Design a protein around this ligand. Structure first.
Ligand SMILES: C[C@H](CS)C(=O)N1CCC[C@@H]1C(=O)O
Ligand SMILES: [Zn+2]
Ligand SMILES: [Zn+2]
Ligand SMILES: [Zn+2]
Length: 233
């Protein structure tokens, strides 16, 4: 029942209810002739919504806000981008123009600036050291260490036992490394273990791209990352 890339035309966004007060949002983008899905999260924050990640671009993110307005009907007041890439910050300007307070760690903001990407307005303190966690309303933000990127954050919704891994966690169907241009391959397995150690009770694990699963996604990602690490030249 989870929306797949073939079921979402580019420019459209689907919402998927994971648990009470927790949705993922699913959008698509074309890249090199293939179409990829991308996930973010929406978490009910009292009578407001906390958004995790843009929908990968300005058009998709406008569609995301319209879909939230139609389906949930609560204001998006804050958004957190979990790393500096365009599937996470692309659309920040759309969110900002709609009155959403946009947040990212100083690490993400610095890297987004270097990359020429959109830059969330607010800085999330307290996440600069591997293993750092901070509360952000109905979620915990966790910096597990460098993995898919040096700044990647994961997001845990304690009320729903939902772990949003972002692009540091691969879906099961991905059996070879994705975009690792900004990755810390040497640290990625250790960073994943930090996620496992902090959230062993997680019941739903949402990858940055593709189908949700359980904590099995963590060891799966480690296996794929290690296989890529050992690629023979
Ligand atoms: C824009 C995102 C950032 S994780 C990205 O690098 N991806 C995911 C796979 C396809 C696309 C790319 O390779 O550009
Ligand atoms: Zn990325
Ligand atoms: Zn990604
Ligand atoms: Zn696997």
């Amino acid at each position: 029942e989870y929306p797949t890339v073939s079921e979402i035309p580019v420019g459209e966004v689907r919402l998927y209810q994971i648990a009470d007060g927790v949705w993922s949002h699913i959008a698509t983008q074309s890249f090199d002739g293939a179409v990829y899905p991308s996930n973010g999260l929406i978490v009910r924050d009292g009578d407001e919504l906390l958004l995790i990640d843009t929908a990968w671009g300005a058009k998709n993110t406008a569609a995301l806000l319209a879909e939230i307005e139609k389906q949930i009907g609560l204001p998006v007041t804050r958004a957190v981008s979990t790393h500096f890439h365009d599937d996470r910050v692309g659309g920040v300007d759309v969110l900002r123009a709609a009155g959403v307070a946009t947040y990212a760690s100083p690490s993400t903001r610095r890297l987004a600036e270097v990359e020429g990407n959109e830059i969330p307005t607010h800085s999330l303190e307290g996440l600069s050291s591997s293993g750092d966690a901070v509360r952000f309303g109905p979620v915990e933000l966790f910096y597990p260490g460098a993995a898919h990127s040096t700044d990647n954050l994961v997001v845990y919704v304690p009320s729903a036992s939902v772990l949003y891994g972002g692009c540091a966690i691969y879906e099961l169907s991905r059996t070879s490394a994705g975009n690792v241009a900004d990755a810390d391959l040497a640290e990625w397995p250790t960073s994943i273990e930090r996620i496992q150690q902090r959230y062993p009770e997680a019941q739903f694990v949402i990858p940055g791209h593709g189908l949700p699963g359980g904590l099995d996604l963590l060891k799966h990602t480690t296996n794929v990352v290690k296989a890529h690490t050992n690629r023979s030249v």
